[model samples]
Target chain A: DALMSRTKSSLSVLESIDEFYAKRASIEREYASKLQELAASSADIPEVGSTLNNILSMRTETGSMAKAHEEVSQQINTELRNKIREYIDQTEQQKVVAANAIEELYQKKTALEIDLSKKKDAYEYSCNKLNSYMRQTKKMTGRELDKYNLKIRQAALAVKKMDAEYRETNELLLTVTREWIDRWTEVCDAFQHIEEYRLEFLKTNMWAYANIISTACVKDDESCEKIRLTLENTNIDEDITQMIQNEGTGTTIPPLPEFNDYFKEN
Target chain B: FRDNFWGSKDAGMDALMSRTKSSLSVLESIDEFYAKRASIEREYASKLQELAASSADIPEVGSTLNNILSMRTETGSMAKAHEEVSQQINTELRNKIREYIDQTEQQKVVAANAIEELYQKKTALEIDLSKKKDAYEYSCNKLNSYMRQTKKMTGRELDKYNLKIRQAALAVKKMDAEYRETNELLLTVTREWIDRWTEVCDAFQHIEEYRLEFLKTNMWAYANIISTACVKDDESCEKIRLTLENTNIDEDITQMIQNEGTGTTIPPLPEFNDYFK
Candidate 1:
């Protein structure tokens, strides 16, 4: 009777060990999909160099456009309206391209980040289950168990080493990313300034033309008054009408100096 | 040993279970390390994005400088033509233009210095980025190679090993997946961050160039206008010229531009000496 009971107890321990083994096996099977997912997602990371190269291309494109705008600005008086319009059209096209690219990049990055977080959690959960199984099957021991423990220890060490390497790599990647971002920040600033300068230049040139036209028309009282009224409506603080009046009815009519004299004095 | 060792199986099983549990705990900690790492990455990425947004609102300094340049040319010629008619009137008109030009000059100096610092920062960042890129690529390749080796070693013998071996393989695969994901996250974060930075930098350089150019010339065409157009004895012209010469236009412009809109604190660049020297 005693022998039978002992046998039954031993058999029960064996069953528990088997249960532990089965549970571990189940975890592996269950998480295989997660493994596949991680593998798939790994391919999605954007290449750092490629992204930066795209930025450089955009910068060059915008720079050339700006130079063209500058040339047109220099020829402001000739085809004023057409040149300004052409410049605006060019700026608009580039702005739209940059905006769209920024949006698309954000979407891709956000999705990847979300996946990363989920994978991290899933991995942790798997490790936890494996750990719990090790604790539950403590009532049976043998060479197989020792071998498993030794293997686990070595695996754990390997994991640690890999993790350290991964972390170091990650840190480096972070720094590179930051640097890349810094460069882009400057790039964005340049684009915005280019647009701003172009617009301001247009406004200044327009005002300059207005001044010249209004000055030339001072003799035509009707034209002068009309121009003054138009400039006033634009909130120009300068007394265009008075300046024209003063020019027309000046007490002292000083003669026009030679261009040579003017140039020499300057 | 085989049949009736009484408590031998129990002792051995207990020992095995304890050791296994201990090993598992170590594994758990290892897995946790990655979790911590992921958290760290998320934090940094978000921080970078936040930084990008905040620094994006730098002023339209470049546009303003261009406007100043164009205005100087326009007014220079206009004042010269107008001077040909009457000295007194030209003096008054030219002085007014001079006043604004002086103000602009002071503003440009401050902006130029700011841009210098910003440029230097960019240079440093470039160096850092290059180093980081090299390091990242090295480790990334190493990780990839390690994964391949692991897969090759384990593929054939996966079935022969006990459940523990299977578990180890699963752990490795899971880690590889996680590692891959982490790598992807880093790459994605970096790319996006860089893209935004590039946009901002583009704007910065555009503005910075104008400021630097303005500073480089140091004296505008309008300065010549003031010196030549103003008469020595006329009281109004003389007073205006003296005031123009003495007025702390740097502070004045700082006040005006800063006060012109939101919270911008661009202080004047002190004295003209040692600038970009």
Candidate 2:
């Protein structure tokens, strides 16, 4: 009787295994369809460089005042803005592309889900059949029912582990998509702040250049060369760099002679 | 004996009352005059010195006289406040004002560098930004390439657990959907920040009011300095006095005065009003 019972239990286990593979095949087919859909959808990403930069501002104005030359300073301000605008435009496009890429990632995720769902359904069906067979084995006296139950549970656990792995991968992919997509503006903003300063520095340099030209009155050959060097290298000072970073536009205009752009304009 | 005592008391009392009245009169008169004279001397001394310095352009001789008057005021004030405590207070006021002036000059230099500092900050930020951006781009490309490779392999394996993990996969898919929504929100925020930067840039250029105010305040000082220096040998004092009497604060007039640096070279101060206009 025990021999007979063992033979029946072995057959039941075989049938359950067969059932699992058949269900797995269906799941595999659905997963493939979902993956294809998700992959196609997550490619477009937007550039947001300028959007972030527009928010930064200098808290104080600390420009050294020379003579007022409004036009020169204003022009510098305009140019600085223009540079930022350019960055914004470029970064905006980049953001669009980034956004698209993120969406594509999502599509890939959906495809993964479809596959996981199919696999789960098939696994569930196998579990049900295996449970029924275990019941039948319980009534027979030849083999212990506990051995069959353990075998079936172990197989189910393996499938559960694979399911968990799939879910974890999905989670990682989601995180990657979110991080890149969310911080898009911050990157652009940092770029914009730099450009604004660059523009301001140029303005300051221009003003300084004008002042050196006017004040030094470089008609002589040697003086002219010296003045030219100073003008050319206006933006090369560590101190000036610190000033631009620390000071706001208002104060930046005063120290620079050309920054008196107002007086110049008038 | 009782009658003799009455007579002694009357004589002695009369002598004592007469002496007391005489002493009282001396004390009252002395104090009243001393206090009044000291108070009057302070005002008189200050008034005299102020009058001397008030001259528009005192001659060398007159300046000497003015200095003498100022010295007298200082000497008298010192005498009046002879106590050590009062002396320290007076000297301290003078010293503190002088120190403040010195400090102001230094502060002005520092203040002047405010604009320069801003420029420097901008430069550093630009440099840092360039490096960060390069790094970000490099990292982004590297990550994307890595993802692409993984994606190609995983594309096949994506459905491996489809049969066993439908619910968990669905949860992940929902997260992906949330990511989409979050991205949209991020984009909106980024766009607003960019617009804000443009507004700040506009602010930088719109500072005409401060410039106008600065010119208005300083132009008078400029004119006064130029005019005070331009007046001739003796005539300068008289002209300065007259000019001070009618100070002009108008921009058009102040500018003319500023350009008067070389007007002395002119053969005749010919109706130089045209140049001013």
Candidate 3:
């Protein structure tokens, strides 16, 4: 009954998982639509006629600064590209390692179960033999009955020993299973974190590029000052700071590859 | 000399007017760019804030799930702990990432507007310069015509005409000086804007680098922890292995019960029966 209760408990946990999964999916759908709307609003371009056309047509003597702007853009692109590639490599490696660990553990668990099953079968056969011996020996008398009773006792003892062993092994397996699930879950969560971080990174870089081009053409201090103020006030400062804090102190992660190398390849 | 100078001044004014109009056209375009950019920026900011508010519950979700996981661990419920942690990840972590994404996108919009503002200001300066040039050309033409008419005058009339020419020349000089000053200011401002914008972009890139470094370090730490904890021979590792193995134990037991040995051997009872006979 305890085993049955535990099984029921596990099923309920699974039910909880399904519920959360569905909730997550619904949230994703809702957010996706919201994001689309935001995108549409941001991309809305105001009508511009000859004013923009004329300005764009004219070779406003931007001197060497235009060239400098181009170079900075390229530089930023290379850096971002290299960083993304590195991120991808690291995440993929982590995924592979986690997956392999899960696979190996699963195989071992399966093999162990198969062995436990065979032992259980042997124990059950002993128990059945002992029962048959009891039924027959009950009708006998004297030496024959005594010898059969002794055999039956030995068989019963063997079955009892096997049962104890099986119970211990089964208990150990339960404990291990719980721990394994915990570890696997953690690995999976880590992978999700990596992917989410990657997505954020790419988006940040995208905005950075837009910032570069738009900022490059700016011709005033007041606007620059305003932008600076906005940047200072934005919520990202906390988010980024939290990330840094999470990284903590005294890490030995490898330095990233140079942007130039990536640029060269491109 | 006066007649030829007047003709040249008229031609210069014509050229100046054309240039000024062209500059005005450019300024208008720049102005339009700013208007649109500013609107988009405001919209983006609004959107970002809205999304942010929506996710305000994210941290709470995380803390709640964390509490549940801790409690489950204390109660020795690993399955429930995993479930709670997973819920935290799907909701809280996802929301956090979404926030970052939104922030970045908003930032881009902000930068775009900043650049547009700069262009708008520059266009206004160019318009000022063009207007100054036009004024300068007009003054020069007036001076040139006044001097030319002075040559046709006699006695007192000639003196008055000469006086008018002198005044006109002074006005032209003043206008020319103002035009030069405005042009210089426009040039300096344009150059400074370009430099500042470049600096801003570089700063953003620097921040991104920091972010990348931080993210990498965080991942490394997580990975390291996992590597140590999930390895072979660890206490939890062996236990988890055993647990997974025992998962099918109940099923095996069921099969054993269902397939109860029909071929179980009948113990020899002939000796006991023969003894009775």
Candidate 4:
């Protein structure tokens, strides 16, 4: 089960990273497109001095803008990743509690069983001794029936009391078993919920980062030739174009998809 | 009438003899049944032996049976003869049955007392087991509470790191605003450099150096944030302490720690000239 969970968790993490690196590549393509426009404009303008100035100014602004966007997106991802790590650590710690509880209960059960055995042995021995004494008294005073009657009454009363005590102990053991079972279920359920929450949290943050890059970054260098060319080429496939735009601009954050709905109600 | 009566006397005498014989047969049958019962009782004598070998539980059982079986036989013939004269066989047989029932009632009590004693020991054991189970539960709870506390501590640590990241991000933004202003000044200086050489270049170079230093400081701050925030919250304080202790801090970043340490310093460089810092 852990391996399966690990595999699923890995896939989710990879999806987030893939989305992020895709955005980085998109930004690179956007930069190339903008530069190609600047190069074309440089040829038309016929003035090296002003062209250098324009290119340098645009470069400084766009570069700073790209750095700023990366910084914010990275911050969001890093914070979200750290939170996910915290959840994982806490979930593991909770399991330790459950495992320890099981261990403790197991120990108690073992100790009680040993003690119960000893008491049972002692009870049997005492019963045998009492039985023997009764027999001897009856035989030795065969005709003296009055003495025998008195002893028999006393033994019967003692036996009744012991039987009552035995019944009470059995009842207590049943109660203890029931109580522990209840606690086990409660703790296990809480831990499971926390893990579910973690998966949800991861998906939300991944989408957040994915959204920022697609829309904001793409709009800035729209007419850049290479980006325009790729956009036109991929326009035949809307999903592919959207995905490419998602990588470049990080504006359209795809939701974590149907996977989330599975755990959502729970 | 007298002659007829005399003729029927033989038949009447035969009828009386048959009735007496039938009564004797009834008594004999009862005796035979009683004898069979006695033999059955003796057959169970080995049961006492079996009980002794198996468990001490039947010691009283065996003794009671043995007691009844080994009672002395009638040794006084005078007493027996007198008994025979006074007691009818049928009455003696009924009295023996009553004696058996009365003895069985007493033995029943003895057997029950043995079982009761066993039940008492079992009861005490159950009580002890219960107390131990309570103690075990208490320990389990203590362990659980501590583990919960540990998880909470780890969560708190994670929040602390995230808060630090936010602090660094804000610091960077505050510095970046100042960076934009410095860039504007540098641009103005570039446009007028030939017309106002010495003053503009000297001023521009000084401001640029300060701007560069500010950027370096912010970047270094972010790196410090990364390193500090990267510390694992594994619930092992000793490991955290060791990790902080083992790695050497860079000389320039040494100021980040609240504690100061002596370290090698960079050599002095040539002073800033008119066009450079």
Candidate 5:
């Protein structure tokens, strides 16, 4: 019964795993969509200057990251969450079915034990009666005594035969229980494998999740690196000098008008 | 007179002065542009820092998990560069340009004052010469009127007219000399003032060139600063990637399996005994 109680909770572990991953999947789903929203907010700017264009171009990297999270959420739900649920259904159902077989055989074994106990009491009671007679005669007698002696012998034989039948029934149930335990042990190992599979699935996927984000970070860096080269190419002196060249006016001072006196004729 | 040189009030100096005043406004415009730009950068950095430091939802520990979370922290640190650049822009770029602007106005005002003074002085001398010429002509007219009156007059009138004629002739000779000197002085100084104004224009041109040089370099430096910030961000992200590369999903999972391993054998069934015993 304790083993049965312990295993029901084991099934609860599977159910708990199912619940956890279900929520975790949705959380990943929400996170991905929100990331996409943030990425959308980014391509929002105009491509004016070099920095702006470079910064804006990185939106695709963000979106790529979002898509990965999205797909990862789906994979977790399919492989991890759904797998836990299936494990609970298949293993617990089989566990209870095997437990039912054990209960039936155990009930039969119990009835046989009670029958053997009653047979043992009857045999012991009959032996006590025979012993009392023996002590009255210091044993038993012949002729009329022979009839009593014959009756006691017959009663002893009957008890021995019934004892043999009780042993046979108990032996048969022992065989059945050993067989059940063997199957149950194997079934337990299968359940353990199920739990292992769930954990492995969770680990693999979460590791993939980290890979997804980390890879995105690399892409984000590459996106930034592209702008680095463009920025390095910029030249202040050249631009300023070009503007100066464009801004040129005549360098020489022009001739000044001569001053005229009021008395001078036109 | 050359408009590009010593332009009078009605000439290129008018356009030149107004244009220089307009050019000064560009300094203010660029200053405000960077101020607002720095404000935006600070705001962006602030949010990224907040986002990076905020605690994550998942409580489970694993190498990949911790590294991923740390990436967010690194992201904030990278954005921290934006904060630094914003400060740099304000300190190095904007404030330095302001200094150039200050230099510009200081030198330009001196040139403007000198040119205006010379123009007014030249006008004063020209006015004085005009007044002297009119006085000489008026004196000649009075002498002519007195000489004409002698034709219709006796000894006293003739004598008086003759005296006025002699006095007017003396005045004419002195006024002519004065007028000649005044004209010569006006011409002399007028040439010098206009030529001096040419140098003043050169000074303004130099200031304008200096302003452009400073502004262009500031913008260029800004581009590099922002670009460097991006590179820093890239470096941070790459660090996270490095940790991520070492993550082994299988190894971690197997370790957990071994730790959780137990209860492999099912509960032993109670062994049966014969009731006769």
Candidate 6:
């Protein structure tokens, strides 16, 4: 039962680890799919200048935004997603492969211990039966005494045989227990090595995950840098100058015509 | 007030003056209206730029998303472009309207004063002509009285009296010529005043009418700023689209693996044993 419970506990620990990675993977997959799909008038005339600019003012976007989400999604799908699956099922697989033989060894050791206990108990019971029989013989008739003497002789031989059997079993159990401990200790070291590897497995991949995310961040920032760079080529001043040239009416206002001095001219 | 700004009745010119002031105040209000528009445009631009500055705490979302965030600066630039339009409205439209209004006010004052001066000159000429008539009439009446006398004085004395009457007629004739010339000049002055009043009114009319088209141009400029901004915005988005084309998932993944790879290998599976074997 101890063997059974310890084995069960180890498997439960493995189960929980797998469950943790599996759930994290579930969240990422949803995030991936979600990111892939993500993002994805007026009035009046006043004649003259009103006509041109008025039309423009009255006049009335998410492809880039959605595309960003999709890019992030795809990055996750190609890189991060590929690795998560291994941690999940990979650990689940470790749990399965490690157990069967270790279980057999623990069970065999337990059985040997049980056999040694049973043999010693059987010797004690035989000796107690002989004592009770001797007391009965004192109260018997001649015929009963004669039968009891024959049974006592058989019982004494049986008791003698049980004692030697118990001793031999004890000796055998000692040698076997030594061999069993040796095997178990070796198994303990093997389990230690495995644990070291499992922890590293989680550690290495965790590091790998961070590296992937950081690389993506670097690339994204580079892309952003390039986007901003192109804007520098834009001629904001020139555009304004063009608008002024195209839209202006006359340069200066017409001065009021000089007042007519009819007498001075005539 | 239409064609009567220079008329004899004081009501005509006075009415024109009163209404002229009313028209100027109304136009100033219109100028005020546009001045406020320029001010608001400036305020809006400032707020927008400030808001653009405000959007910076959260990062990530990749450069494809980052491109759009960068566009916020351009949006604020668009707002700044509108401020330029406001500047045009203030200097070219509002200020220009005030200039014309100022010009109209000055001319009306000068022209109205001249009209009153013309009336005074004409009245002065008429009073001097009346004095000339009184002198001529007195000499003729004295000559007639001497001719009707029943008792005659010495012939020499009569001759001297005739000479005096003759000289008076000659003096009257010269004055009559002066009177015609003065009247003619006064008439010319009246004509001059009439034409000046019309010119001043016309100047006022031209300025106010010119306002319509000038106002329209400023409005057009305001809208043009927005249109220009839209054009720039489109270009920015276009830039965003182009920049996104090179985004690489596979390369980043490869880099990640390469960078994160452990120099040492992991140990083999933990082996299990069977003592029975």
Chain A TM-score values for every predicted structure, listed in order? 0.29, 0.24, 0.32, 0.29, 0.48, 0.58
> Which has the greatest DockQ?
5
lDDT by residue for model 5 (A1-266), tens: 22444444555554454444445434433433333233323433333232111222223323322432333343334334433443543454455446445644554464455455445444434433433443444234433554666666665565466545545554554555455555556545655565456455544554454444444445434444433434344444354334434333444544433544334642
Superposed model 1: Cα runs more than 4 Å off: A1-148, A212-266, B1-277
For all the predictions, what are the DockQ values?
0.01, 0.00, 0.03, 0.00, 0.07, 0.02
TM-score of each: 0.19, 0.18, 0.26, 0.20, 0.54, 0.35
- Chain B TM-score, one value per candidate, order as shown: 0.26, 0.26, 0.37, 0.23, 0.78, 0.53
DockQ of 3: 0.03
Q: Residue-wise lDDT of candidate 6 within A127-195, one digit each (tens)?
A: 445435544453463556456777666655765675455456555555555555556556545644553
* lDDT (Cα, tens digit) per residue for candidate 4, span B1-277: 0111111212322432342343234324334433432333232223323322332222111212222111111112212322332232224543544443455445334432333343344345445444544444444444445555565766544333444444445444433443333444444433332223223223322332332233233323322222221221111222322332332222222122221242113121212132321
How much lDDT does candidate 5 score?
A: 0.52
Summarize candidate 6's per-residue lDDT along B1-277 as a digit string, tens digits. Answer: 2332343434434645655675566457556656655665566456556655555433223422333354445445545655675677787777777776887678557645665665466556557655544555554455545554523554554344555566556555744565445556555655665566566555544543444344334434433433443344345444443443444232212211122232222221111112211
Question: Candidate 6 — what's its lDDT?
Answer: 0.46
Q: Which candidate number would show the highest TM-score if scored against the true structure?
A: 5
Number of the candidate with higher TM-score, 4 or 6: 6
lDDT of 2 at B173: 49
Interface residue Cα RMSD of candidate 2 after superposition: 55.1
lDDT of 4 by residue, A135-164 (tens): 566566767866677777676576455545
lDDT of each: 0.34, 0.32, 0.39, 0.34, 0.52, 0.46
Which sections of candidate 6 miss by over 4 Å?
Answer: A1-4, A31-33, A40-155, A241-266, B1-277
How many pairs of residues collide in each model? 32, 91, 9, 12, 2, 1
Compose the digit string of candidate 2's lDDT tens values, residues A34-118.
2212221222111212111111111100010111121123323333433333344334334434543453455446445545544
- Judged by lDDT relative to the true structure, which candidate is superior, 1 or 6? 6
